[PDB]
PDB file of N, CA and C in Angstrom:
ATOM      1  N   UNK A   1      -0.140-121.242 104.038  1.00 24.03           N
ATOM      2  CA  UNK A   1       0.778-121.248 104.381  1.00 24.03           C
ATOM      3  C   UNK A   1       1.897-120.434 104.847  1.00 24.03           C
ATOM      4  N   UNK A   2       1.877-119.008 105.062  1.00 22.76           N
ATOM      5  CA  UNK A   2       2.256-118.428 105.756  1.00 22.76           C
ATOM      6  C   UNK A   2       2.774-119.256 107.085  1.00 22.76           C
ATOM      7  N   UNK A   3       4.520-118.687 106.697  1.00 24.29           N
ATOM      8  CA  UNK A   3       5.337-118.913 108.801  1.00 24.29           C
ATOM      9  C   UNK A   3       6.016-117.550 108.881  1.00 24.29           C
ATOM     10  N   UNK A   4       6.298-116.864 109.206  1.00 24.17           N
ATOM     11  CA  UNK A   4       6.887-115.654 109.358  1.00 24.17           C
ATOM     12  C   UNK A   4       7.461-115.038 110.828  1.00 24.17           C
ATOM     13  N   UNK A   5       8.066-116.259 110.438  1.00 23.71           N
ATOM     14  CA  UNK A   5       9.195-116.690 112.032  1.00 23.71           C
ATOM     15  C   UNK A   5      10.302-116.830 112.183  1.00 23.71           C
ATOM     16  N   UNK A   6      11.056-117.132 112.890  1.00 22.14           N
ATOM     17  CA  UNK A   6      12.462-117.652 113.054  1.00 22.14           C
ATOM     18  C   UNK A   6      13.024-117.906 114.308  1.00 22.14           C
ATOM     19  N   UNK A   7      14.402-117.940 114.494  1.00 24.52           N
ATOM     20  CA  UNK A   7      15.078-118.778 115.032  1.00 24.52           C
ATOM     21  C   UNK A   7      16.332-118.963 116.477  1.00 24.52           C
ATOM     22  N   UNK A   8      16.588-117.987 116.874  1.00 24.47           N
ATOM     23  CA  UNK A   8      17.702-116.886 117.157  1.00 24.47           C
ATOM     24  C   UNK A   8      17.902-117.294 118.736  1.00 24.47           C
ATOM     25  N   UNK A   9      17.348-118.541 119.432  1.00 25.41           N
ATOM     26  CA  UNK A   9      17.636-118.728 120.828  1.00 25.41           C
ATOM     27  C   UNK A   9      19.182-118.820 120.705  1.00 25.41           C
ATOM     28  N   UNK A  10      20.047-118.398 120.151  1.00 23.77           N
ATOM     29  CA  UNK A  10      21.593-118.675 120.810  1.00 23.77           C
ATOM     30  C   UNK A  10      22.354-117.669 119.965  1.00 23.77           C
ATOM     31  N   UNK A  11      21.935-116.608 119.602  1.00 23.46           N
ATOM     32  CA  UNK A  11      22.559-115.515 119.379  1.00 23.46           C
ATOM     33  C   UNK A  11      22.907-114.877 120.652  1.00 23.46           C
ATOM     34  N   UNK A  12      23.248-113.901 120.706  1.00 23.12           N
ATOM     35  CA  UNK A  12      23.930-113.934 118.904  1.00 23.12           C
ATOM     36  C   UNK A  12      25.538-113.760 119.249  1.00 23.12           C
ATOM     37  N   UNK A  13      25.404-113.472 117.636  1.00 21.10           N
ATOM     38  CA  UNK A  13      27.253-113.681 117.245  1.00 21.10           C
ATOM     39  C   UNK A  13      28.372-112.511 117.627  1.00 21.10           C
ATOM     40  N   UNK A  14      29.429-113.512 117.095  1.00 19.77           N
ATOM     41  CA  UNK A  14      30.909-112.198 117.736  1.00 19.77           C
ATOM     42  C   UNK A  14      30.536-110.971 116.719  1.00 19.77           C
ATOM     43  N   UNK A  15      30.706-111.873 115.254  1.00 19.73           N
ATOM     44  CA  UNK A  15      30.900-110.885 113.883  1.00 19.73           C
ATOM     45  C   UNK A  15      30.024-112.022 112.914  1.00 19.73           C
ATOM     46  N   UNK A  16      29.868-111.267 111.514  1.00 21.43           N
ATOM     47  CA  UNK A  16      29.016-111.288 110.640  1.00 21.43           C
ATOM     48  C   UNK A  16      30.101-111.466 109.490  1.00 21.43           C
ATOM     49  N   UNK A  17      28.746-111.546 107.738  1.00 24.34           N
ATOM     50  CA  UNK A  17      30.088-111.539 107.013  1.00 24.34           C
ATOM     51  C   UNK A  17      29.038-109.855 106.362  1.00 24.34           C
ATOM     52  N   UNK A  18      28.356-109.250 106.903  1.00 24.12           N
ATOM     53  CA  UNK A  18      28.358-108.103 106.043  1.00 24.12           C
ATOM     54  C   UNK A  18      28.137-106.488 107.166  1.00 24.12           C
ATOM     55  N   UNK A  19      24.563-113.019 105.402  1.00 24.60           N
ATOM     56  CA  UNK A  19      24.752-112.172 103.729  1.00 24.60           C
ATOM     57  C   UNK A  19      23.953-111.351 104.238  1.00 24.60           C
ATOM     58  N   UNK A  20      23.407-110.561 102.650  1.00 22.41           N
ATOM     59  CA  UNK A  20      23.063-109.098 102.748  1.00 22.41           C
ATOM     60  C   UNK A  20      21.038-109.265 103.601  1.00 22.41           C
ATOM     61  N   UNK A  21      20.086-110.265 102.125  1.00 23.28           N
ATOM     62  CA  UNK A  21      19.319-110.017 102.215  1.00 23.28           C
ATOM     63  C   UNK A  21      18.030-109.842 103.452  1.00 23.28           C
ATOM     64  N   UNK A  22      17.581-108.762 103.306  1.00 24.60           N
ATOM     65  CA  UNK A  22      16.617-108.486 104.903  1.00 24.60           C
ATOM     66  C   UNK A  22      15.971-108.863 105.372  1.00 24.60           C
ATOM     67  N   UNK A  23      15.777-107.688 106.653  1.00 25.09           N
ATOM     68  CA  UNK A  23      14.086-108.087 107.379  1.00 25.09           C
ATOM     69  C   UNK A  23      13.838-107.054 107.637  1.00 25.09           C
ATOM     70  N   UNK A  24      12.404-106.907 108.569  1.00 25.04           N
ATOM     71  CA  UNK A  24      12.432-105.353 109.329  1.00 25.04           C
ATOM     72  C   UNK A  24      12.168-105.934 110.514  1.00 25.04           C
ATOM     73  N   UNK A  25      12.995-106.063 111.939  1.00 24.49           N
ATOM     74  CA  UNK A  25      12.238-105.973 112.849  1.00 24.49           C
ATOM     75  C   UNK A  25      10.996-105.579 113.288  1.00 24.49           C
ATOM     76  N   UNK A  26      10.206-105.793 114.953  1.00 26.92           N
ATOM     77  CA  UNK A  26       9.661-105.351 115.214  1.00 26.92           C
ATOM     78  C   UNK A  26       9.721-104.048 116.330  1.00 26.92           C
ATOM     79  N   UNK A  27      10.634-103.173 115.411  1.00 29.34           N
ATOM     80  CA  UNK A  27      11.963-101.990 116.282  1.00 29.34           C
ATOM     81  C   UNK A  27      11.428-100.999 115.375  1.00 29.34           C
ATOM     82  N   UNK A  28      11.361-100.745 114.062  1.00 28.45           N
ATOM     83  CA  UNK A  28      11.179 -99.027 112.985  1.00 28.45           C
ATOM     84  C   UNK A  28      12.208-100.023 112.666  1.00 28.45           C
ATOM     85  N   UNK A  29      12.997-100.883 112.075  1.00 30.16           N
ATOM     86  CA  UNK A  29      13.993-101.809 111.802  1.00 30.16           C
ATOM     87  C   UNK A  29      13.826-102.219 110.871  1.00 30.16           C
ATOM     88  N   UNK A  30      14.224-101.697 109.777  1.00 32.95           N
ATOM     89  CA  UNK A  30      15.580-103.078 108.575  1.00 32.95           C
ATOM     90  C   UNK A  30      16.913-103.616 108.959  1.00 32.95           C
ATOM     91  N   UNK A  31      17.299-105.028 109.082  1.00 31.77           N
ATOM     92  CA  UNK A  31      17.829-105.143 109.241  1.00 31.77           C
ATOM     93  C   UNK A  31      19.015-106.193 107.723  1.00 31.77           C
ATOM     94  N   UNK A  32      20.164-105.827 107.489  1.00 33.34           N
ATOM     95  CA  UNK A  32      21.121-105.861 106.532  1.00 33.34           C
ATOM     96  C   UNK A  32      20.978-107.843 106.461  1.00 33.34           C
ATOM     97  N   UNK A  33      20.908-107.842 107.674  1.00 34.03           N
ATOM     98  CA  UNK A  33      20.755-108.983 107.724  1.00 34.03           C
ATOM     99  C   UNK A  33      20.696-110.318 108.907  1.00 34.03           C
ATOM    100  N   UNK A  34      20.665-111.920 109.321  1.00 31.60           N
ATOM    101  CA  UNK A  34      19.967-112.142 110.405  1.00 31.60           C
ATOM    102  C   UNK A  34      20.409-112.037 111.681  1.00 31.60           C
ATOM    103  N   UNK A  35      22.143-111.638 110.791  1.00 33.07           N
ATOM    104  CA  UNK A  35      23.202-111.281 112.284  1.00 33.07           C
ATOM    105  C   UNK A  35      22.221-109.787 113.112  1.00 33.07           C
ATOM    106  N   UNK A  36      22.603-109.236 112.685  1.00 34.71           N
ATOM    107  CA  UNK A  36      21.251-107.619 112.639  1.00 34.71           C
ATOM    108  C   UNK A  36      20.395-107.350 113.210  1.00 34.71           C
ATOM    109  N   UNK A  37      19.398-108.758 112.984  1.00 35.56           N
ATOM    110  CA  UNK A  37      18.395-108.983 113.304  1.00 35.56           C
ATOM    111  C   UNK A  37      18.065-109.168 114.454  1.00 35.56           C
ATOM    112  N   UNK A  38      19.621-110.673 114.555  1.00 34.63           N
ATOM    113  CA  UNK A  38      18.897-111.176 116.075  1.00 34.63           C
ATOM    114  C   UNK A  38      19.888-111.436 117.162  1.00 34.63           C
ATOM    115  N   UNK A  39      20.705-110.254 116.784  1.00 34.78           N
ATOM    116  CA  UNK A  39      21.108-109.291 118.151  1.00 34.78           C
ATOM    117  C   UNK A  39      20.149-108.567 118.459  1.00 34.78           C
ATOM    118  N   UNK A  40      19.251-107.920 117.576  1.00 35.38           N
ATOM    119  CA  UNK A  40      18.717-106.674 118.345  1.00 35.38           C
ATOM    120  C   UNK A  40      17.838-108.043 118.795  1.00 35.38           C
ATOM    121  N   UNK A  41      17.580-108.950 118.615  1.00 37.73           N
ATOM    122  CA  UNK A  41      16.632-109.977 119.188  1.00 37.73           C
ATOM    123  C   UNK A  41      16.510-110.406 120.828  1.00 37.73           C
ATOM    124  N   UNK A  42      18.609-110.700 120.407  1.00 35.00           N
ATOM    125  CA  UNK A  42      18.765-111.205 121.673  1.00 35.00           C
ATOM    126  C   UNK A  42      18.680-110.176 122.838  1.00 35.00           C
ATOM    127  N   UNK A  43      19.225-109.114 122.427  1.00 31.71           N
ATOM    128  CA  UNK A  43      19.027-107.880 123.587  1.00 31.71           C
ATOM    129  C   UNK A  43      17.429-107.278 123.468  1.00 31.71           C
ATOM    130  N   UNK A  44      16.519-107.612 122.730  1.00 33.54           N
ATOM    131  CA  UNK A  44      15.099-107.285 123.233  1.00 33.54           C
ATOM    132  C   UNK A  44      15.283-107.864 123.831  1.00 33.54           C
ATOM    133  N   UNK A  45      15.002-109.272 125.004  1.00 32.41           N
ATOM    134  CA  UNK A  45      14.335-110.296 125.791  1.00 32.41           C
ATOM    135  C   UNK A  45      13.123-111.141 124.891  1.00 32.41           C
ATOM    136  N   UNK A  46      13.298-110.764 123.902  1.00 31.96           N
ATOM    137  CA  UNK A  46      11.958-111.304 123.234  1.00 31.96           C
ATOM    138  C   UNK A  46      10.906-109.976 123.288  1.00 31.96           C
ATOM    139  N   UNK A  47      11.337-109.518 122.865  1.00 33.87           N
ATOM    140  CA  UNK A  47      10.441-108.422 122.449  1.00 33.87           C
ATOM    141  C   UNK A  47       9.967-107.583 120.856  1.00 33.87           C
ATOM    142  N   UNK A  48      11.388-106.943 120.006  1.00 35.84           N
ATOM    143  CA  UNK A  48      11.153-107.261 119.224  1.00 35.84           C
ATOM    144  C   UNK A  48      10.670-107.721 118.112  1.00 35.84           C
ATOM    145  N   UNK A  49      11.635-108.829 117.686  1.00 34.20           N
ATOM    146  CA  UNK A  49      10.700-110.125 116.874  1.00 34.20           C
ATOM    147  C   UNK A  49      10.561-109.570 115.431  1.00 34.20           C
ATOM    148  N   UNK A  50      10.263-110.794 114.541  1.00 34.90           N
ATOM    149  CA  UNK A  50      10.592-110.102 112.835  1.00 34.90           C
ATOM    150  C   UNK A  50       8.813-110.569 112.831  1.00 34.90           C
ATOM    151  N   UNK A  51       8.888-108.438 112.049  1.00 36.44           N
ATOM    152  CA  UNK A  51       8.208-108.538 111.070  1.00 36.44           C
ATOM    153  C   UNK A  51       7.189-109.124 110.077  1.00 36.44           C
ATOM    154  N   UNK A  52       8.888-109.576 109.467  1.00 34.75           N
ATOM    155  CA  UNK A  52       8.474-110.313 108.232  1.00 34.75           C
ATOM    156  C   UNK A  52       9.711-109.927 107.914  1.00 34.75           C
ATOM    157  N   UNK A  53      10.302-110.653 107.458  1.00 32.91           N
ATOM    158  CA  UNK A  53      11.371-111.452 106.061  1.00 32.91           C
ATOM    159  C   UNK A  53      11.361-110.247 104.941  1.00 32.91           C
ATOM    160  N   UNK A  54      12.440-110.396 104.191  1.00 30.80           N
ATOM    161  CA  UNK A  54      12.641-108.834 103.186  1.00 30.80           C
ATOM    162  C   UNK A  54      12.160-107.636 104.203  1.00 30.80           C
ATOM    163  N   UNK A  55      13.005-106.409 102.978  1.00 33.70           N
ATOM    164  CA  UNK A  55      12.882-105.428 103.811  1.00 33.70           C
ATOM    165  C   UNK A  55      10.781-105.386 103.618  1.00 33.70           C
ATOM    166  N   UNK A  56      11.215-103.923 105.212  1.00 30.91           N
ATOM    167  CA  UNK A  56      10.009-103.503 105.031  1.00 30.91           C
ATOM    168  C   UNK A  56       8.782-103.431 104.500  1.00 30.91           C
TER     169      UNK A  56
END
């Protein structure tokens, strides 16, 4: 059933309303939203990507 990835080939967005609910990047950083996550991704050029949703 496990499927733990995301769909951020359109990020970065210019701004965001912090949701809260957290992830953990593959950069040794938790992310306070999808926004700071995927902004990390788009910067990464695909290499960060999601370790897992929720905090780390």
